[PDB]
Amino acid sequence: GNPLVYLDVDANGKPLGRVVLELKADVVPKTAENFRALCTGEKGFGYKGSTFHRVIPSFMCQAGDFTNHNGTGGKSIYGSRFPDENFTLKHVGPGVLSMANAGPNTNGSQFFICTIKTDWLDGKHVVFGHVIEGMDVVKKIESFGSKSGRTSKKIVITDCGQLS
Numbered sequence: 001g002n003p004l005v006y007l008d009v010d011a012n013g014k015p016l017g018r019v020v021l022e023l024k025a026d027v028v029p030k031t032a033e034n035f036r037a038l039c040t041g042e043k044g045f046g047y048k049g050s051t052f053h054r055v056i057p058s059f060m061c062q063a064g065d066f067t068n069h070n071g072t073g074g075k076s077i078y079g080s081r082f083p084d085e086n087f088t089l090k091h092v093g094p095g096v097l098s099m100a101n102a103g104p105n106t107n108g109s110q111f112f113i114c115t116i117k118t119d120w121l122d123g124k125h126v127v128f129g130h131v132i133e134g135m136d137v138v139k140k141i142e143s144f145g146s147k148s149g150r151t152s153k154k155i156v157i158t159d160c161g162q163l164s
Ligand SMILES: CSc1ccccc1[C@H]1CCCN1C(=O)CNC(=O)NCc1ccc(N)cc1
Pocket: 060, 062, 071, 072, 073, 074, 099, 100, 101, 102, 106, 107, 108, 109, 110, 112
């Protein structure tokens, strides 16, 4: 079946809790596999110890830049970038997990979790999963954001991996 992966999140060193995600490998196997491997760190690099660098309330929480820590970096398990796999899943509501990008066919490692229906991103960002458990943790992260994206606390993925 589809992989389940987790992110354990801290804010200013204080544990917020765990987010569990289903990766829709049945629909986007290449994109799901990239995220899964970056969660386990099995290639020698990954999300562990990286941060949520842009958080905008009533929009999304963005993370995954483990190279530059500012939204300019990250890489995939395939190379620096890989193509948009398909746009079959939509941004249907809160909890949707989607690839951040810098235009068509520039997927790397950066991702976001939506806190509302962001239907205007349909066809532009590849949706590849959703939150199974821990929307309360997501809502906490959201609360530390601002209109500009700057966080008022340092939000760290302290651990991550695969559950099944
Ligand atoms: C103000 S944030 C924003 C605004 C309009 C549309 C999209 C967004 C944010 C959250 C939804 C995801 N997103 C972006 O992807 C904005 N782009 C980037 O942050 N690009 C930086 C970047 C991303 C991926 C890669 N591989 C390299 C650089």
